[PDB]
A paper describes a structure:
The two [name] complexes, RalGAP1 and [name], act as GAPs (GTPase activating proteins) that limit Ral-GTP levels by promoting hydrolytic activity. They comprise one of the catalytic α-subunits [name]α1 (RGα1) in the RalGAP1 complex or [name]α2 (RGα2) in the [name] complex, and a common regulatory β-subunit (RGβ)11–13.
Here, we present a cryo-EM structure of [name] that reveals an extended 58 nm tetrameric architecture comprising two heterodimers of the [name]α and [name]β subunits. The resolution of the focused maps was 4.4 Å at the hinge region between the two “half-mustaches”, 3.8 Å for the central region of the RGα2/RGβ heterodimer, and 3.9 Å for the peripheral region at the tip of the complex. However, the reconstruction includes a portion of a second RGβ subunit of the adjacent “half-mustache”, which allowed us to unambiguously model the N-terminal portion of the second RGβ subunit and a small part of the second RGα2 subunit. Interestingly, between β4 and αA of both RGα2 and RGβ SD domains, large loop regions with little secondary structure except for two helical segments are inserted. These loops reach over from RGα2 to RGβ and from RGβ to RGα2, respectively, thereby linking the subunits with each other and accounting for one-third of the heterodimer interface (buried surface RGα2-RGβ: 10,443 Å2, RGα2-RGβhug: 3923 Å2, RGα2hug-RGβ: 3574 Å2). However, the RGβ hug domain makes extensive contacts with RGα2, in particular the long hug helix that runs alongside the HEAT and GAP domains and holds them together. Unexpectedly, the structure reveals homodimerization of RGβ via its N-terminal region at the central interface between the two half-particles.
Residue numbers in the entry:
A (entry chain B): 17 to 356, 428 to 461, 507 to 657
B (entry chain C): 17 to 65
The structure:
């Protein structure tokens, strides 16, 4: 429905007629100091003719002030919903909904990237974006159809400006943050009152999955989900529960009009709005979007374009940022508001560990193991059991844990603590640092992984300065954590003695080279 | 019914629009050719405009 009637005519005559129409009308309506002038539009046919002829003008190149007049009169017209103006024609005020719907439909053509006029295109796009942002922020009452049209328009323009691969110096690089921010703000405002239908949620989730290669998307999602989860826990438990810290602006993104019941649905839907963050770890999955496949048809240069696109170099940082965001969410849920610098004691009102595992651990486990099978995305892998390693140490005394989670955690611990060839310093340091009370929490069967921890400590404590680990963690804190771990294992031999310890031989996991893998090692050795 | 939509706009831009929109139509109608270009207008809105 956004196709203009004037497209049938040749380009030159269409440009000429569009310029001729927009010159006096633009110079009157768009330009200031025109108060008191009678409106040039009086009839519905007049306004429809004017709307169509202006709509064709957007496709024209940004040379001259014709596009400036078009965008100015568009911004003036869309502001009629917020408050009537003298320059607004009377029939527009009489029937605002249909006319603003048609204007929004026409505005879709504006956001299409152009050849060489990006210097003014960025300014015009940001002006239109902020005009729509203020239109929705202080919006008057309007039907939900207008809200749905606005949401579809925002999704369409974001798809137009984000789906193609990022080229350095393009408009998309400079406008991605603004586009995603305004999309999230308008979506939150819509969920405040309209609460869009599930089909719109599905369409947004399908479309947003194709923009994961832009670094601003994950950052905005993390900020908004942090704000939502802070708002949720502000009343889920009560004032007794520690309050999640949140920047004032991010807390201001959500409006306070939302009732308590409506917060949970939108929080869950936005938490699952982005796809599985583990997908960011896989470079092939990201480089498989329909636009990328169409781009792959145009790909004829280096054979490694499946993994050497210009926009595929930011994947490790994006994955690390997503993992940091989810770790912050888990810390807020658990009660460790402050980072990890001392860490406050867990709140007595925290939920059970199994519920936290059900809610988040699947993503955490997948993110840890995907890089366990894979020194490229080491930061995300380290943060993965930063979160996990920390979750289990916060269990309440005498609390049952589902054995599947314990088995997965033990397998992760065994995989992480390797020194022969499959050694990764960041994940090993994170695992050592994040779990001092690991053995002291009387975890069921934790004593199986004891020989692996003993082997791991032999390569860190005798070291003088820890050159390998000095670029990831503070050597003194790492040494303190190692001492805490070792000091919690000294009583074990004399307490147990001749008691056998089971060995899990599923491959080249054991570090010892005594040719006694099929033998339970006693603590005396 | 003889009133025109373009009357409200200034006369210079009105005549510019008129000539720029009627010149291609006159060129197409003149010098008939065997090839069928399916005219230029397709829908009700186009012919109305």
């Amino acid at each position: 429905g956004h196709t203009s009637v004037l497209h049938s005519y040749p380009e030159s005559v269409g440009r000429e007629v569009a310029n001729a129409v927009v010159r006096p009308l633009g110079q009157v309506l768009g330009t200031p100091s025109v108060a008191g002038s009678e409106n040039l539009l009086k009839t519905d046919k007049e306004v429809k003719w004017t709307m169509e002829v202006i709509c064709y003008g957007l496709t024209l190149p940004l040379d001259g002030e014709t596009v400036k007049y078009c965008v100015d009169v568009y911004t003036d017209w869309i502001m009629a919903l917020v408050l009537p103006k003298d320059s607004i024609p009377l029939p527009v005020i009489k029937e605002p909904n249909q006319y603003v719907q048609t204007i929004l439909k026409h505005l879709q053509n504006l956001f299409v990237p152009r050849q060489e006029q990006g210097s003014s295109q960025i300014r015009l796009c940001l002006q239109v974006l902020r005009a729509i942002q203020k239109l929705a922020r202080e919006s008057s009452l309007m039907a939900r159809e207008t809200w749905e049209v606005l949401l579809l328009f925002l999704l369409q323009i974001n798809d137009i400006l984000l789906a193609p691969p990022t080229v350095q110096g393009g408009i998309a690089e400079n406008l991605a943050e603004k586009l995603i921010g305004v999309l999230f703000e308008v979506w939150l405002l819509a969920c405040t009152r309209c609460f869009p239908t599930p089909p719109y949620w599905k369409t947004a989730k399908e479309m947003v999955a194709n923009w994961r290669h832009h670094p601003a998307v994950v950052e905005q999602w993390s900020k908004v989900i942090c704000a939502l989860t802070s708002r949720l826990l502000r009343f889920t438990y009560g004032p007794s529960f520690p309050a999640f810290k949140v920047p004032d602006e991010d807390a201001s993104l959500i409006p306070p009009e939302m009732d308590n019941e409506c917060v949970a649905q939108t929080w869950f839907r936005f938490l699952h709005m982005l796809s599985n963050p583990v997908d960011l770890s896989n470079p092939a999955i990201i480089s498989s979007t329909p636009k990328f496949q169409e781009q792959f048809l145009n790909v004829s240069g280096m054979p490694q374009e499946l993994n050497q696109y210009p926009c595929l170099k930011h994947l490790p940082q994006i994955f690390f940022r997503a993992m940091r965001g989810i770790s912050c969410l888990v810390d807020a849920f658990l009660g460790i508001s402050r980072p990890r610098e001392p860490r406050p004691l867990p709140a007595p009102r925290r939920p059970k560990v199994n519920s936290i595992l059900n809610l988040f651990g699947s993503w955490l486990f997948d993110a840890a193991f995907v890089h366990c099978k894979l020194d490229n995305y080491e930061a995300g892998r380290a943060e993965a059991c930063g979160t996990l390693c920390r979750i289990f140490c916060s269990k309440k005394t005498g609390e049952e844990i589902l054995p599947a989670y314990l088995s997965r955690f033990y397998m992760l611990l065994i995989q992480g603590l390797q020194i022969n060839d499959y050694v990764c310093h960041p994940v090993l340091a994170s695992v050592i640092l994040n779990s001092p009370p690991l053995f002291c929490c009387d975890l069921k069967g934790i004593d199986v992984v004891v020989p692996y921890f003993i082997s791991a400590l032999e390569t860190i404590l005798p070291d003088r300065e820890l050159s390998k680990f000095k670029s990831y963690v503070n050597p003194t804190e790492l040494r303190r954590s190692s001492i805490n771990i070792l000091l919690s294992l000294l009583p074990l031999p004399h307490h147990f003695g001749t008691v056998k310890s089971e060995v899990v031989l599923e491959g080249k996991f054991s570090n010892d080279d005594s040719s006694s893998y099929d033998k339970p090692i006693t603590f005396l050795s």
